[PDB]
Amino acid sequence: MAVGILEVSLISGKGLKRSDFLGKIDPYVEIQYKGQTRKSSVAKEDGGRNPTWNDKLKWRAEFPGSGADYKLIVKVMDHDTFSSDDFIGEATVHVKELLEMGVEKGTAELRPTKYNIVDSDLSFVGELLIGVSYSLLQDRGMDGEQFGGWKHSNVDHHHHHH
Numbered sequence: 001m002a003v004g005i006l007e008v009s010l011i012s013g014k015g016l017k018r019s020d021f022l023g024k025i026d027p028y029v030e031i032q033y034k035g036q037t038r039k040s041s042v043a044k045e046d047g048g049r050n051p052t053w054n055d056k057l058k059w060r061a062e063f064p065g066s067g068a069d070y071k072l073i074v075k076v077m078d079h080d081t082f083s084s085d086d087f088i089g090e091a092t093v094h095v096k097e098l099l100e101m102g103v104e105k106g107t108a109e110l111r112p113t114k115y116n117i118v119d120s121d122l123s124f125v126g127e128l129l130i131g132v133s134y135s136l137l138q139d140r141g142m143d144g145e146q147f148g149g150w151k152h153s154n155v156d157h158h159h160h161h162h
Contacts, residue, residue, distance in 0.1 A: 002103030011129035012048025091125035109133035
């Protein structure tokens with residue numbers, strides 16, 4: 001139950017899905033000097049080659065609705081013996097617990113844990129960076145700086161017999 005703007009880091013991301021022609025035009029950075037700004041749309045299929053400080057993404061968030069207990073979303077990760085180190089990521093999945101905890105003190109931030117983002121049974125998760133926190137605000141600024149990147153591919157196996 002919190003209404004504010006969300007923050008995302010433009011680290012990396014894999015686009016398992018397609019769209020109406022995906023080239024070097026769709027994936028645009030948020031750069032402007034007038035008044036309004038635009039956030040980079042979905043990933044253009046494996047675009048982690050780019051940095052993270054390149055730019056940030058913001059979106060409007062509103063109170064999801066009192067849940068009153070229920071909904072764990074904390075028991076859907078991997079490697080749980082005491083305290084895992086490696087982390088996978090987080091995708092568009094039931095996680096209002098983060099934005100809802102924001103209104104508590106005015107701001108919220110995901111806890112230090114490897115959330116769920118692997119193809120299993122949640123919401124068709126994929127690949128994303130961890131750190132997307134939520135805070136109470138509505139002053140969508142602009143910021144950003146000119147930049148770009150590129151990509152090709154990356155595949156290989158390990159077979160020395162039949």
